[PDB]
Write an enzyme that holds these catalytic residues in place. Structure first.
Site, short mmCIF file in Angstrom:
data_model
loop_
_atom_site.label_atom_id
_atom_site.label_comp_id
_atom_site.label_asym_id
_atom_site.label_seq_id
_atom_site.Cartn_x
_atom_site.Cartn_y
_atom_site.Cartn_z
N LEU A 1 -20.06 5.51 -27.91
CA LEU A 1 -19.07 5.05 -26.90
C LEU A 1 -19.67 3.85 -26.17
CD1 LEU A 1 -17.68 8.44 -25.66
CD2 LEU A 1 -16.23 6.45 -26.05
N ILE A 2 -18.87 2.81 -25.92
CA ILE A 2 -19.30 1.52 -25.30
C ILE A 2 -18.46 1.31 -24.03
CG2 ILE A 2 -17.86 -0.33 -26.29
CD1 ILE A 2 -20.57 -1.54 -27.35
N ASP B 1 -28.44 -3.32 -43.10
CA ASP B 1 -26.96 -3.12 -43.07
C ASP B 1 -26.16 -4.37 -42.66
OD1 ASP B 1 -24.55 -1.85 -43.40
OD2 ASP B 1 -24.68 -0.78 -41.51
N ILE C 1 -14.91 -0.03 -23.80
CA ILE C 1 -14.50 -1.30 -24.46
C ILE C 1 -14.52 -1.07 -25.98
CG2 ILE C 1 -14.75 -3.28 -22.94
CD1 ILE C 1 -17.75 -3.00 -23.19
N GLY C 2 -14.44 0.18 -26.41
CA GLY C 2 -14.42 0.56 -27.83
C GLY C 2 -15.30 1.76 -28.10
N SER C 3 -15.69 1.96 -29.36
CA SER C 3 -16.58 3.05 -29.83
C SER C 3 -16.69 2.96 -31.36
CB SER C 3 -16.10 4.43 -29.36
OG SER C 3 -14.68 4.56 -29.41
N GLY C 4 -17.85 3.33 -31.91
CA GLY C 4 -18.04 3.54 -33.35
C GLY C 4 -18.14 5.02 -33.64
N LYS D 1 -24.24 1.37 -24.39
CA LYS D 1 -24.01 2.19 -25.61
C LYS D 1 -24.52 3.59 -25.28
CE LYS D 1 -23.51 1.13 -30.51
NZ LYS D 1 -24.00 0.38 -31.69
#
Ligand SMILES: N#CCc1ccc(Nc2nccc(Nc3cc(C4CC4)[nH]n3)n2)cc1
Length: 313
Positions: free
Chosen positions: A28-29, A149, A21-24, A47
């Site tokens: 990885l998610i 942050d 469902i995405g990633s930073g 995560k």
């Protein structure tokens, strides 16, 4: 990693994966379901990394306890607390390399993605977001943790309740008060200018260990960005020393530095006062959360649902 893959957390709970469902960077998610409860309803995500995830793990194991959070909400009469729930963690093999995973509460879209005109939200939204995070900051601070942050990309709308907002990505979070022992003040240039340069605290610029005030400063800068549409130092983002002196000048020249910046159809009286109150904190001082929420809401208004309407933009 194949969908269908069954993960085994340290608690011995078993987690079946879904679709990425995405990633930073470092993450990885995937969606996830427990293997015993139903599958009508993906409430959970996983995560994965393989450093910063371990920081989250530490944060979430220590701070994000369901019932303790339950006790807190009830006392302070909050409708909710913007902290993602933590369900468990462990290791899993993918090649011959091992990966660390954390099962988290599922949540909606991040605020930067859904910014209004440029990076701007409506004042009363900007002021509610600041109050909501003040609720979250009180809680984490009280539990020996700073975020370090705060920024739009780490504010997520609820999955269940979209009018609910949640502070995420505790990858730069720091335990400032281990078992009541506040860290000492030591400037370290070698540890200097970590964080998001746009929003990072002067303590962070000067390589000081993050304490409670730095989060308050950060929230201040954020609000200013969400209202006026940018920051005096939008130019100097690549020279962090330039950013530090800018921030330094803004705080030393309050409140006018901030009052002057607002466009005319909006006010920075609250944001200015808020930063004035944030600047008067010693390194180890407890922020007056209740007073700052009054500063952010000087008319004692109740909080509506979050308005992100971009009609005309
Ligand atoms: N948007 C976006 C990208 C994004 C990626 C990672 C994180 N971090 C993070 N930290 C703690 C809990 C948590 N839960 C999630 C994650 C999602 C899906 C992935 C959107 N819903 N709920 N996510 C936040 C946003």
């Amino acid at each position: 990693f194949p969908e269908g893959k069954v993960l085994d957390d340290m608690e011995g709970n078993q987690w079946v994966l879904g679709k990425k469902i995405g990633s930073g960077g470092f993450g990885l998610i995937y969606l996830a379901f427990p293997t015993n409860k139903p599958e009508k309803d993906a409430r959970h995500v996983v995560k994965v990394e393989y450093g910063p995830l371990f920081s989250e793990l530490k944060f979430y194991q220590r701070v994000a306890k369901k019932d303790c959070i339950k006790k807190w909400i009830e006392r302070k009469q909050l409708d909710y607390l913007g902290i993602p729930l933590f369900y468990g963690s462990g290791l899993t093999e993918f090649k011959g390399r091992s990966y660390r995973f954390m099962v988290m509460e599922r949540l909606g879209i991040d605020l930067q993605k859904i910014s209004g005109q440029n990076g701007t939200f409506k004042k009363s939204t900007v002021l509610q977001l600041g109050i909501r995070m003040l609720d979250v900051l009180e809680y984490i601070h009280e539990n020996e943790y700073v975020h370090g942050d705060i920024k739009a990309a780490n504010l997520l709308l609820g999955y269940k309740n979209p009018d609910q907002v949640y502070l995420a990505d505790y990858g730069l979070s720091y335990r400032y008060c281990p078992n009541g022992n506040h860290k000492q003040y030591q400037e370290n240039p070698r540890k200097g200018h970590n964080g998001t340069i746009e929003f990072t605290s002067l303590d962070a610029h000067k390589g000081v260990a993050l304490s409670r005030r730095s989060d308050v400063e950060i929230l201040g800068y954020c609000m200013l960005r969400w209202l006026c549409g940018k920051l005096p130092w939008e130019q100097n983002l690549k020279d962090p020393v330039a950013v530090q002196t800018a921030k330094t000048n803004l705080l030393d020249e309050l409140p006018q530095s901030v009052l002057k910046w607002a466009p005319s159809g909006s006010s920075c009286c609250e944001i200015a006062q808020f930063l004035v109150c944030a600047h008067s904190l010693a390194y180890d001082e407890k922020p007056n959360y209740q007073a700052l929420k009054k500063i952010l809401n000087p008319h004692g208004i109740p909080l509506g649902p979050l308005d992100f309407s971009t009609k005309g933009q």
